Short mmCIF file of N, CA, C and O in Angstrom, two decimals:
data_model
loop_
_atom_site.label_atom_id
_atom_site.label_comp_id
_atom_site.label_asym_id
_atom_site.label_seq_id
_atom_site.Cartn_x
_atom_site.Cartn_y
_atom_site.Cartn_z
N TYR A 1 0.91 -1.52 -0.50
CA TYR A 1 -0.25 -0.19 0.30
C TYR A 1 0.53 1.43 -0.04
O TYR A 1 1.69 1.15 0.77
N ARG A 2 0.27 1.80 -0.59
CA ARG A 2 1.23 3.54 -0.52
C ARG A 2 0.23 4.58 -0.90
O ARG A 2 -0.64 4.66 -0.93
N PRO A 3 0.52 6.29 -0.33
CA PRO A 3 -0.57 7.14 -0.09
C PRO A 3 -0.85 7.36 -1.65
O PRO A 3 0.29 7.62 -2.04
N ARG A 4 -1.87 8.46 -1.85
CA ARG A 4 -1.95 9.29 -2.97
C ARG A 4 -1.33 10.42 -2.74
O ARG A 4 -0.81 11.06 -1.86
N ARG A 5 -1.17 10.72 -3.70
CA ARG A 5 0.21 12.27 -4.21
C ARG A 5 -1.15 13.22 -3.86
O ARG A 5 -2.14 13.11 -5.13
N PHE A 6 -0.94 14.44 -3.16
CA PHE A 6 -1.27 15.34 -2.81
C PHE A 6 -0.95 16.31 -4.78
O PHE A 6 -0.21 16.38 -5.44
N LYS A 7 -1.26 18.23 -3.83
CA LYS A 7 -1.35 18.68 -5.08
C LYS A 7 0.19 18.90 -5.49
O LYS A 7 1.38 18.74 -4.40
N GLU A 8 1.01 19.76 -6.21
CA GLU A 8 2.07 19.42 -6.57
C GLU A 8 3.04 21.44 -6.26
O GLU A 8 3.94 21.36 -5.05
N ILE A 9 2.15 22.34 -5.15
CA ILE A 9 1.82 23.20 -4.37
C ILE A 9 2.02 22.26 -3.39
O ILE A 9 3.07 23.00 -1.90
N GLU A 10 1.47 21.81 -2.51
CA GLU A 10 1.59 20.69 -1.54
C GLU A 10 2.75 20.14 -0.75
O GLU A 10 3.38 20.16 0.15
N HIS A 11 3.23 19.82 -1.91
CA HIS A 11 4.01 19.22 -2.12
C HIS A 11 5.95 20.20 -2.05
O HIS A 11 6.48 18.80 -1.30
N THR A 12 5.56 20.79 -2.66
CA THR A 12 6.94 22.28 -2.34
C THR A 12 6.87 23.09 -1.04
O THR A 12 7.77 22.60 -0.45
N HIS A 13 5.90 23.64 -1.04
CA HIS A 13 6.15 23.95 0.45
C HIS A 13 5.01 23.68 1.00
O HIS A 13 4.23 24.42 2.35
N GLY A 14 4.32 22.38 1.58
CA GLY A 14 3.15 21.94 2.76
C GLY A 14 3.81 21.90 3.77
O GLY A 14 4.78 20.70 3.66
N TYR A 15 2.83 22.19 4.98
CA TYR A 15 3.68 21.21 5.81
C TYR A 15 2.29 21.15 6.72
O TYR A 15 0.86 22.40 6.83
N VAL A 16 2.56 20.27 7.68
CA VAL A 16 1.08 19.53 8.85
C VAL A 16 1.46 20.03 9.89
O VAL A 16 2.77 19.54 10.60
N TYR A 17 0.38 19.84 10.42
CA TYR A 17 0.81 19.56 12.31
C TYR A 17 0.24 17.90 12.78
O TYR A 17 -0.81 17.64 12.33
N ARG A 18 1.18 17.54 13.35
CA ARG A 18 0.56 15.77 14.43
C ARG A 18 0.89 16.04 15.75
O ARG A 18 2.41 16.39 15.93
N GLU A 19 0.47 15.12 15.96
CA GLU A 19 0.74 14.53 17.17
C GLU A 19 1.41 12.91 16.87
O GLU A 19 0.53 12.04 16.42
N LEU A 20 2.65 12.74 18.11
CA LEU A 20 2.75 11.46 17.87
C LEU A 20 2.45 10.19 19.13
O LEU A 20 2.91 9.38 18.92
N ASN A 21 1.38 11.11 20.19
CA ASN A 21 0.74 10.21 21.03
C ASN A 21 -0.83 8.56 21.23
O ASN A 21 -1.02 9.54 21.05
N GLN A 22 0.70 7.88 20.81
CA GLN A 22 -1.05 6.43 20.31
C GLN A 22 -1.68 6.27 22.25
O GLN A 22 -2.71 5.96 22.01
N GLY A 23 -1.37 6.49 23.28
CA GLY A 23 -1.96 6.73 23.89
C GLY A 23 -1.86 5.13 24.34
O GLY A 23 -1.95 4.72 23.92
N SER A 24 -2.48 4.82 25.80
CA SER A 24 -3.14 3.83 25.82
C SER A 24 -4.41 3.34 26.19
O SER A 24 -5.19 4.11 27.09
N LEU A 25 -5.33 1.85 26.38
CA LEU A 25 -6.77 1.63 27.46
C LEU A 25 -6.19 1.66 28.38
O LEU A 25 -7.73 0.54 29.55
N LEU A 26 -4.72 0.95 29.03
CA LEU A 26 -4.98 0.65 30.65
C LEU A 26 -5.04 1.00 31.19
O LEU A 26 -6.28 0.52 32.42
N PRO A 27 -5.34 2.84 31.60
CA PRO A 27 -6.46 3.51 32.54
C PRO A 27 -7.37 2.34 33.10
O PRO A 27 -8.49 3.18 34.19
N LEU A 28 -7.81 3.27 32.07
CA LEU A 28 -10.01 2.81 32.26
C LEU A 28 -9.65 0.65 32.00
O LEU A 28 -10.81 0.82 32.77
N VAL A 29 -8.90 0.22 31.32
CA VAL A 29 -9.23 -1.23 31.67
C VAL A 29 -8.69 -1.58 33.14
O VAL A 29 -9.60 -2.19 34.00
N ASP A 30 -7.65 -1.14 33.55
CA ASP A 30 -7.28 -1.40 34.90
C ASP A 30 -8.03 -1.64 36.17
O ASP A 30 -8.29 -0.06 36.96
N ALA A 31 -9.44 -2.11 36.34
CA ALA A 31 -9.82 -1.75 37.95
C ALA A 31 -10.67 -3.67 38.12
O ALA A 31 -10.73 -3.94 36.75
N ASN A 32 -11.85 -3.44 38.30
CA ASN A 32 -12.72 -4.30 39.08
C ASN A 32 -13.88 -4.28 37.98
O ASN A 32 -14.27 -3.79 38.55
N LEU A 33 -14.23 -5.03 37.16
CA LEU A 33 -14.96 -4.99 36.32
C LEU A 33 -15.92 -5.89 36.07
O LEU A 33 -16.92 -6.57 35.45
N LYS A 34 -16.22 -6.51 37.71
CA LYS A 34 -17.34 -7.67 37.66
C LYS A 34 -17.99 -6.77 38.11
O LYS A 34 -19.20 -6.96 37.37
N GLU A 35 -18.79 -5.57 38.11
CA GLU A 35 -19.99 -5.25 38.23
C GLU A 35 -20.33 -4.37 37.07
O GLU A 35 -21.42 -4.56 36.46
N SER A 36 -19.63 -3.64 36.25
CA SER A 36 -20.02 -3.08 35.22
C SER A 36 -19.78 -3.74 33.85
O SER A 36 -20.59 -3.88 33.25
N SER A 37 -19.47 -5.51 34.05
CA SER A 37 -19.24 -5.84 32.92
C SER A 37 -20.49 -6.64 31.95
O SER A 37 -20.71 -6.21 31.11
N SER A 38 -21.94 -7.14 32.88
CA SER A 38 -23.31 -6.89 32.37
C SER A 38 -23.05 -5.82 32.00
O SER A 38 -24.40 -5.29 30.66
N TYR A 39 -23.27 -4.16 32.04
CA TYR A 39 -23.45 -3.11 31.61
C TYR A 39 -22.85 -3.28 30.31
O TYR A 39 -23.89 -3.20 29.18
N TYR A 40 -21.29 -4.06 30.10
CA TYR A 40 -21.11 -3.43 29.21
C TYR A 40 -21.42 -4.24 27.66
O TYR A 40 -21.69 -4.61 27.07
N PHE A 41 -21.46 -5.40 28.72
CA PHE A 41 -22.40 -7.03 27.43
C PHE A 41 -23.21 -6.73 26.88
O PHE A 41 -23.83 -6.98 25.46
N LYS A 42 -24.64 -5.56 27.68
CA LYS A 42 -25.04 -5.02 27.16
C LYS A 42 -25.17 -4.74 25.68
O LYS A 42 -26.02 -4.72 25.13
N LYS A 43 -24.33 -3.43 26.15
CA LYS A 43 -24.34 -2.43 25.11
C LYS A 43 -23.14 -3.60 23.95
O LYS A 43 -23.17 -3.14 23.27
N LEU A 44 -22.64 -4.59 23.80
CA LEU A 44 -21.50 -5.42 23.18
C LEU A 44 -22.61 -5.84 21.97
O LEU A 44 -22.45 -5.85 20.42
N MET A 45 -23.92 -6.69 23.11
CA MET A 45 -24.80 -7.30 21.47
C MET A 45 -25.70 -5.68 21.05
O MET A 45 -26.21 -6.40 19.93
N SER A 46 -25.33 -5.14 21.16
CA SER A 46 -26.39 -3.93 20.32
C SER A 46 -25.48 -3.62 19.68
O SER A 46 -26.02 -3.15 18.06
N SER A 47 -24.92 -3.78 19.60
CA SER A 47 -23.92 -3.35 18.22
C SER A 47 -23.53 -3.82 17.11
O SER A 47 -24.16 -3.19 16.01
N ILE A 48 -23.62 -5.37 17.01
CA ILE A 48 -24.72 -6.07 15.70
C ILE A 48 -25.86 -6.58 15.90
O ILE A 48 -26.58 -7.38 16.93
N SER A 49 -27.29 -6.42 15.35
CA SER A 49 -27.81 -6.43 14.80
C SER A 49 -28.56 -7.94 14.66
O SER A 49 -29.59 -8.31 14.45
N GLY B 1 1.67 23.02 -56.18
CA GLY B 1 1.37 21.77 -56.36
C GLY B 1 0.35 21.36 -55.46
O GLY B 1 -0.23 21.68 -54.90
N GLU B 2 -0.19 19.65 -55.99
CA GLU B 2 -0.84 19.03 -55.55
C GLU B 2 -0.51 18.42 -53.86
O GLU B 2 0.59 18.34 -53.61
N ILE B 3 -1.63 18.52 -52.85
CA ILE B 3 -0.95 18.48 -51.97
C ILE B 3 -1.02 16.72 -51.31
O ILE B 3 -1.71 16.42 -51.38
N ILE B 4 0.34 16.44 -51.25
CA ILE B 4 0.50 15.05 -50.65
C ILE B 4 -0.07 15.04 -49.00
O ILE B 4 -0.46 14.00 -48.28
N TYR B 5 0.21 15.59 -48.11
CA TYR B 5 1.26 14.88 -46.98
C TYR B 5 1.18 16.85 -45.97
O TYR B 5 1.85 18.09 -46.00
N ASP B 6 -0.31 17.00 -45.10
CA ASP B 6 -0.81 17.79 -44.93
C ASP B 6 -0.72 18.03 -43.28
O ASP B 6 -2.17 17.77 -42.82
N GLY B 7 -0.18 17.24 -42.55
CA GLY B 7 -1.01 17.00 -40.91
C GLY B 7 -1.82 15.87 -41.61
O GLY B 7 -1.35 15.29 -42.11
N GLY B 8 -2.88 15.80 -40.70
CA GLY B 8 -3.81 14.86 -40.10
C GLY B 8 -3.80 14.57 -38.93
O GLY B 8 -3.76 15.60 -37.97
N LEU B 9 -4.98 13.83 -38.44
CA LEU B 9 -5.20 12.89 -37.62
C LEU B 9 -4.40 11.92 -36.42
O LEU B 9 -2.96 11.52 -37.27
N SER B 10 -3.55 12.92 -35.36
CA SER B 10 -2.27 12.28 -34.64
C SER B 10 -2.92 11.64 -33.17
O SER B 10 -4.02 11.81 -32.74
N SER B 11 -2.29 10.01 -33.59
CA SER B 11 -2.65 9.11 -32.30
C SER B 11 -1.69 10.23 -30.91
O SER B 11 -0.29 10.20 -31.11
N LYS B 12 -2.81 9.63 -29.57
CA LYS B 12 -1.32 9.87 -28.82
C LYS B 12 -1.61 8.57 -27.93
O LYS B 12 -2.11 7.55 -27.79
N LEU B 13 -0.44 8.62 -27.30
CA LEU B 13 0.04 7.46 -26.98
C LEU B 13 -1.52 7.05 -24.94
O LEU B 13 -1.17 5.96 -24.89
N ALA B 14 -1.12 8.12 -24.67
CA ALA B 14 -1.78 7.52 -22.98
C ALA B 14 -2.36 9.66 -23.11
O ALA B 14 -2.29 10.32 -23.48
N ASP B 15 -3.61 9.08 -22.06
CA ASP B 15 -4.16 10.59 -21.78
C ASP B 15 -4.52 11.09 -20.37
O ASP B 15 -3.79 9.62 -19.87
N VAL B 16 -3.87 11.87 -19.92
CA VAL B 16 -3.85 12.20 -18.32
C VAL B 16 -4.44 12.70 -17.53
O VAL B 16 -5.11 13.86 -18.43
N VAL B 17 -4.95 12.09 -16.82
CA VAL B 17 -5.88 13.30 -16.03
C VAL B 17 -5.74 13.69 -15.18
O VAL B 17 -4.82 13.71 -14.20
N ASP B 18 -6.74 15.08 -15.17
CA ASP B 18 -6.19 15.88 -14.56
C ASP B 18 -7.26 16.61 -13.47
O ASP B 18 -7.06 17.26 -12.57
N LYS B 19 -8.09 15.28 -13.05
CA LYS B 19 -8.82 15.23 -11.59
C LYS B 19 -7.96 14.33 -10.70
O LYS B 19 -7.57 13.33 -11.28
N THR B 20 -8.52 14.45 -9.28
CA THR B 20 -8.27 13.40 -8.53
C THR B 20 -9.01 12.20 -8.74
O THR B 20 -10.29 12.03 -8.62
N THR B 21 -8.61 11.43 -8.44
CA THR B 21 -9.20 10.08 -8.99
C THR B 21 -9.81 8.96 -7.93
O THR B 21 -8.67 9.17 -6.48
N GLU B 22 -10.94 8.56 -7.10
CA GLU B 22 -10.88 7.29 -6.85
C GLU B 22 -9.68 6.38 -7.07
O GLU B 22 -10.12 6.04 -8.05
N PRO B 23 -9.72 5.19 -5.89
CA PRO B 23 -9.03 3.92 -6.56
C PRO B 23 -9.54 2.80 -7.35
O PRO B 23 -11.15 3.01 -6.70
N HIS B 24 -9.52 2.00 -8.08
CA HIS B 24 -10.34 2.15 -8.61
C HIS B 24 -9.34 0.34 -9.28
O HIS B 24 -8.13 0.50 -9.06
N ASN B 25 -9.97 -0.50 -9.25
CA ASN B 25 -9.33 -1.70 -10.76
C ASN B 25 -9.27 -1.36 -11.63
O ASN B 25 -10.01 -0.36 -11.96
N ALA B 26 -9.02 -2.20 -12.41
CA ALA B 26 -9.18 -2.13 -14.12
C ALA B 26 -9.87 -2.47 -15.04
O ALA B 26 -11.13 -3.52 -14.57
N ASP B 27 -10.58 -1.33 -15.78
CA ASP B 27 -11.89 -1.93 -16.56
C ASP B 27 -11.39 -1.39 -17.63
O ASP B 27 -11.96 -0.47 -18.40
N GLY B 28 -10.29 -1.95 -18.60
CA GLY B 28 -9.81 -0.43 -19.56
C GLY B 28 -10.10 -2.87 -20.52
O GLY B 28 -10.45 -2.82 -20.91
N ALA B 29 -8.86 -3.35 -21.19
CA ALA B 29 -8.85 -4.39 -21.75
C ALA B 29 -8.92 -5.67 -21.03
O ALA B 29 -8.71 -6.69 -21.62
N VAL B 30 -8.06 -5.14 -19.91
CA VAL B 30 -8.16 -6.47 -19.08
C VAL B 30 -8.88 -5.33 -17.24
O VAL B 30 -9.12 -4.63 -17.13
N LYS B 31 -10.36 -6.55 -17.30
CA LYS B 31 -10.96 -6.21 -16.45
C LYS B 31 -11.09 -7.29 -15.63
O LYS B 31 -10.60 -8.85 -15.79
N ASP B 32 -11.26 -6.76 -14.40
CA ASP B 32 -9.98 -7.27 -12.82
C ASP B 32 -11.60 -7.93 -12.33
O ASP B 32 -12.78 -7.60 -12.13
N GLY B 33 -11.92 -9.21 -12.64
CA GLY B 33 -13.07 -10.07 -11.84
C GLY B 33 -13.01 -9.62 -10.04
O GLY B 33 -14.09 -10.46 -9.61
N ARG B 34 -12.14 -9.88 -9.58
CA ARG B 34 -12.82 -9.15 -7.82
C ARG B 34 -13.22 -8.28 -7.76
O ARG B 34 -13.38 -6.80 -8.39
N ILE B 35 -13.57 -7.70 -6.54
CA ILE B 35 -14.40 -6.76 -5.76
C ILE B 35 -13.64 -5.71 -5.22
O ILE B 35 -12.61 -5.69 -5.99
N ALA B 36 -14.32 -4.54 -6.04
CA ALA B 36 -13.56 -3.28 -6.28
C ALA B 36 -12.56 -2.71 -4.35
O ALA B 36 -13.58 -3.23 -3.57
N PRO B 37 -12.26 -1.90 -4.41
CA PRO B 37 -11.61 -1.89 -3.52
C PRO B 37 -12.57 -0.69 -2.03
O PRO B 37 -13.70 -0.83 -2.10
N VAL B 38 -12.57 -1.77 -0.97
CA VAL B 38 -13.44 -1.75 -0.02
C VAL B 38 -12.75 -0.45 0.59
O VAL B 38 -11.84 -0.50 1.00
N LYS B 39 -13.67 1.08 1.07
CA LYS B 39 -13.17 2.26 1.00
C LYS B 39 -13.99 2.35 2.39
O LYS B 39 -14.94 1.43 2.99
N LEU B 40 -13.74 2.03 3.84
CA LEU B 40 -13.09 2.21 4.97
C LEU B 40 -13.39 2.97 5.81
O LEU B 40 -11.93 4.17 5.72
N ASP B 41 -14.01 3.52 6.73
CA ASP B 41 -14.02 5.13 7.68
C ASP B 41 -13.15 4.74 9.20
O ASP B 41 -13.91 3.79 9.79
N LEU B 42 -12.28 4.70 9.38
CA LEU B 42 -11.21 4.62 9.45
C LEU B 42 -10.66 6.05 10.45
O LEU B 42 -10.25 7.00 9.88
N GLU B 43 -9.80 6.00 11.70
CA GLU B 43 -9.11 7.01 11.96
C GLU B 43 -9.50 8.10 11.54
O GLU B 43 -9.54 9.67 11.27
N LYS B 44 -10.35 7.73 12.71
CA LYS B 44 -11.61 9.55 12.69
C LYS B 44 -11.36 10.24 14.16
O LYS B 44 -10.72 9.09 15.59
N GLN B 45 -10.82 11.63 14.20
CA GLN B 45 -10.19 12.20 15.46
C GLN B 45 -11.04 12.15 16.45
O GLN B 45 -10.44 12.31 17.73
N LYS B 46 -12.92 12.75 16.70
CA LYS B 46 -13.36 12.69 17.50
C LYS B 46 -14.42 11.04 17.38
O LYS B 46 -14.78 10.67 16.50
N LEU B 47 -14.55 10.99 18.58
CA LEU B 47 -14.65 9.25 18.70
C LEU B 47 -16.84 9.99 18.28
O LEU B 47 -17.62 10.85 18.32
N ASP B 48 -17.40 8.46 17.92
CA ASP B 48 -18.64 8.61 17.36
C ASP B 48 -19.42 7.12 16.53
O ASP B 48 -18.03 5.90 17.07
N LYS B 49 -19.77 7.31 17.52
CA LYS B 49 -20.77 4.90 17.73
C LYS B 49 -20.02 4.53 18.41
O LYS B 49 -20.29 2.91 18.84
N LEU B 50 -19.33 4.95 19.10
CA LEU B 50 -18.24 3.80 20.72
C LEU B 50 -18.73 4.27 22.50
O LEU B 50 -18.74 5.11 22.27
N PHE C 1 -35.72 -24.64 20.38
CA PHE C 1 -36.81 -25.75 19.57
C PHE C 1 -37.26 -24.33 18.76
O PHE C 1 -37.59 -24.83 17.69
N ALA C 2 -37.18 -23.35 18.73
CA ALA C 2 -37.42 -22.20 18.05
C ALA C 2 -35.92 -21.41 17.98
O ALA C 2 -35.88 -20.28 18.12
N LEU C 3 -35.38 -21.37 17.05
CA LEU C 3 -33.60 -21.53 16.91
C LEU C 3 -33.69 -20.69 15.53
O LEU C 3 -34.10 -21.74 14.38
N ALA C 4 -33.78 -19.37 15.61
CA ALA C 4 -34.00 -18.58 14.11
C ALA C 4 -32.78 -18.84 13.93
O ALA C 4 -31.04 -18.70 14.07
N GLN C 5 -32.80 -18.13 12.20
CA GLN C 5 -31.89 -18.24 11.35
C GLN C 5 -31.04 -17.00 11.68
O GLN C 5 -31.87 -16.19 11.61
N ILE C 6 -29.73 -17.07 12.02
CA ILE C 6 -28.76 -15.40 11.56
C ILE C 6 -27.84 -15.50 10.41
O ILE C 6 -27.17 -16.43 10.28
N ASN C 7 -27.99 -14.64 9.27
CA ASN C 7 -27.84 -14.92 8.82
C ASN C 7 -26.61 -13.69 8.19
O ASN C 7 -27.18 -12.26 8.24
N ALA C 8 -25.46 -13.06 7.71
CA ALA C 8 -24.61 -11.85 7.41
C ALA C 8 -24.28 -11.86 6.54
O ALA C 8 -22.78 -11.48 6.58
N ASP C 9 -24.73 -12.20 5.78
CA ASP C 9 -24.23 -12.40 3.72
C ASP C 9 -23.96 -10.62 3.72
O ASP C 9 -23.32 -10.42 3.07
N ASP C 10 -24.94 -10.34 4.01
CA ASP C 10 -24.92 -8.53 3.57
C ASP C 10 -24.29 -7.98 4.15
O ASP C 10 -23.30 -6.55 4.05
N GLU C 11 -23.79 -8.61 6.00
CA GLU C 11 -22.36 -7.53 6.33
C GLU C 11 -21.06 -7.76 6.32
O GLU C 11 -20.35 -6.68 6.32
N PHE C 12 -20.63 -8.78 5.53
CA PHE C 12 -19.72 -9.50 4.93
C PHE C 12 -19.11 -8.11 3.14
O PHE C 12 -19.77 -9.14 2.52
N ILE C 13 -18.28 -8.31 2.55
CA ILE C 13 -18.00 -6.95 1.59
C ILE C 13 -16.67 -8.14 1.50
O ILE C 13 -15.39 -8.29 1.82
N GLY C 14 -16.61 -9.24 1.00
CA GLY C 14 -15.63 -10.64 0.88
C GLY C 14 -15.59 -11.26 2.26
O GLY C 14 -15.84 -12.04 2.62
N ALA C 15 -14.38 -10.95 2.26
CA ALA C 15 -14.14 -11.43 3.33
C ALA C 15 -13.62 -10.15 4.65
O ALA C 15 -13.68 -10.36 5.40
N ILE C 16 -14.05 -9.44 4.64
CA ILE C 16 -14.17 -7.45 5.45
C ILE C 16 -15.50 -7.24 5.86
O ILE C 16 -16.46 -7.16 5.11
N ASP C 17 -15.14 -7.36 7.17
CA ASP C 17 -16.82 -6.69 8.14
C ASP C 17 -16.16 -5.42 7.95
O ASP C 17 -15.87 -5.07 9.02
N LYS C 18 -16.82 -4.32 7.31
CA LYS C 18 -16.45 -2.73 7.16
C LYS C 18 -17.16 -2.50 8.64
O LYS C 18 -16.27 -1.12 9.56
N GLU C 19 -18.09 -2.44 9.46
CA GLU C 19 -18.15 -2.28 11.12
C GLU C 19 -17.96 -3.01 11.75
O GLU C 19 -17.86 -1.50 12.53
N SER C 20 -17.80 -4.14 11.64
CA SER C 20 -16.75 -3.85 12.70
C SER C 20 -15.10 -3.90 12.61
O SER C 20 -14.73 -3.07 13.53
N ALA C 21 -14.67 -3.20 11.66
CA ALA C 21 -13.40 -3.18 11.48
C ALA C 21 -13.83 -1.58 12.14
O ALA C 21 -12.33 -1.03 12.07
N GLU C 22 -14.81 -1.11 12.00
CA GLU C 22 -14.59 0.91 12.07
C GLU C 22 -15.13 1.05 13.77
O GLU C 22 -14.52 1.93 14.25
N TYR C 23 -15.13 0.39 14.20
CA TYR C 23 -15.92 -0.23 15.82
C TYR C 23 -15.01 -0.16 16.05
O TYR C 23 -14.24 0.42 17.75
N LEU C 24 -14.00 -0.84 16.16
CA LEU C 24 -12.84 -1.53 16.73
C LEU C 24 -11.68 -0.30 16.56
O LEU C 24 -11.12 0.62 17.40
N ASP C 25 -11.69 0.30 15.39
CA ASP C 25 -10.71 1.80 15.00
C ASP C 25 -10.74 2.51 16.88
O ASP C 25 -9.65 3.51 16.12
N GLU C 26 -11.61 2.64 16.85
CA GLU C 26 -12.46 3.85 17.46
C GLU C 26 -12.14 3.79 19.06
O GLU C 26 -11.85 4.74 19.63
N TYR C 27 -11.27 2.73 19.36
CA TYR C 27 -10.65 2.68 20.95
C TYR C 27 -9.28 2.85 20.31
O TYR C 27 -8.55 3.65 21.68
N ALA C 28 -9.00 2.98 19.40
CA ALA C 28 -7.66 3.85 19.09
C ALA C 28 -7.41 5.32 19.31
O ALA C 28 -6.89 6.31 20.30
N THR C 29 -8.85 5.97 19.49
CA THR C 29 -8.60 7.81 19.44
C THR C 29 -8.99 7.87 20.71
O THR C 29 -8.90 8.29 21.82
N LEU C 30 -10.12 6.68 21.60
CA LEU C 30 -10.35 6.95 22.78
C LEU C 30 -9.02 6.20 24.09
O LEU C 30 -8.70 6.83 24.82
N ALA C 31 -7.79 5.61 23.50
CA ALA C 31 -7.07 5.88 23.88
C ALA C 31 -5.69 7.27 23.94
O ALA C 31 -5.68 7.60 25.06
N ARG C 32 -5.74 7.77 23.00
CA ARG C 32 -5.37 9.16 22.96
C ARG C 32 -5.79 9.71 23.72
O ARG C 32 -5.59 10.77 24.56
N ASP C 33 -7.89 10.06 23.68
CA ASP C 33 -8.14 10.93 25.00
C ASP C 33 -7.73 10.22 26.12
O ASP C 33 -7.29 11.46 26.88
N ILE C 34 -7.63 8.84 27.15
CA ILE C 34 -7.43 9.06 28.07
C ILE C 34 -6.29 9.60 28.44
O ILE C 34 -5.76 9.52 29.63
N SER C 35 -5.37 9.48 27.80
CA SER C 35 -3.58 9.19 28.56
C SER C 35 -3.42 11.08 28.13
O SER C 35 -2.76 11.47 29.24
N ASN C 36 -4.20 11.59 27.52
CA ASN C 36 -4.35 13.15 26.90
C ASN C 36 -4.86 13.27 28.70
O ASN C 36 -4.48 14.62 28.93
N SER C 37 -5.35 13.48 28.53
CA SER C 37 -6.51 13.88 29.69
C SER C 37 -5.45 13.38 30.69
O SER C 37 -6.19 14.69 32.28
N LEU C 38 -4.94 12.89 31.00
CA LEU C 38 -4.27 12.11 32.91
C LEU C 38 -3.38 13.25 32.57
O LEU C 38 -3.22 14.08 33.93
N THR C 39 -2.88 13.46 31.30
CA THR C 39 -1.63 14.37 31.42
C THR C 39 -2.34 15.95 31.63
O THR C 39 -1.14 16.68 32.93
N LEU C 40 -2.68 15.88 31.27
CA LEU C 40 -3.28 17.93 31.49
C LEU C 40 -3.95 17.63 33.31
O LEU C 40 -3.74 18.58 33.34
N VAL C 41 -4.62 16.53 33.69
CA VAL C 41 -5.09 16.58 35.19
C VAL C 41 -3.67 16.99 35.85
O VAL C 41 -3.89 17.10 37.06
N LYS C 42 -3.32 15.79 35.40
CA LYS C 42 -1.65 16.06 36.42
C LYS C 42 -1.30 17.14 36.75
O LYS C 42 -0.95 17.46 38.18
N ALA C 43 -0.43 17.51 35.78
CA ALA C 43 -0.05 19.05 35.66
C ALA C 43 -0.99 20.06 35.73
O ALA C 43 -0.07 21.22 36.66
N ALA C 44 -1.66 20.32 36.01
CA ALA C 44 -2.89 21.45 36.05
C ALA C 44 -3.58 21.04 38.47
O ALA C 44 -3.42 22.57 38.86
N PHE C 45 -2.77 20.40 38.69
CA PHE C 45 -4.23 20.54 40.13
C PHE C 45 -2.64 19.65 40.78
O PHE C 45 -2.75 19.61 42.16
N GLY C 46 -1.60 18.85 39.99
CA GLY C 46 -0.72 18.09 40.60
C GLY C 46 -1.15 17.15 41.84
O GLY C 46 -2.07 16.76 41.67
N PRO C 47 -0.26 17.56 42.71
CA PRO C 47 -0.48 15.82 44.05
C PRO C 47 -1.55 16.67 44.83
O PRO C 47 -1.79 18.21 45.17
N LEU C 48 -2.67 15.77 45.66
CA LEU C 48 -3.92 16.18 46.28
C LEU C 48 -4.11 16.20 47.43
O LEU C 48 -3.34 14.74 48.02
N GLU C 49 -4.54 16.64 47.94
CA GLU C 49 -4.80 17.05 49.76
C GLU C 49 -6.20 16.34 49.54
O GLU C 49 -7.40 17.23 49.55
N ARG C 50 -5.85 15.65 50.88
CA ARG C 50 -7.97 15.47 51.61
C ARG C 50 -8.02 15.93 53.20
O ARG C 50 -7.58 15.32 54.16
#
């Protein structure tokens, strides 16, 4: 796979702002999930009809 | 005198599209029998449907 | 006794499930928000006392 080319002006004088922080889901995951699992499972079933 | 050769219809090797094109498979002398590329909505900056 | 038939033929385009792939990609956005929100609160409030 490869990206598509932009306009010629954007390749010569183009600048972009980007952030490199992917982060982690651990702070939300790291918990006692016994009580909230049932509520999560209900939402999981509704995602697919 | 009589004109034997004065220009004429000229063949072009290739045409060049001046507009940006969406990804596509071959649909000319070669036709691709596979499914067209699937367009997926990814890398959403703001959360939606989650 | 009454087991409903579940068909997901319309959901799959070849071997790609567009809806599932897009839903899973939103967790990457949530990961960025969790880390950024935690850092921003830490710098603004610092250690906490009760």
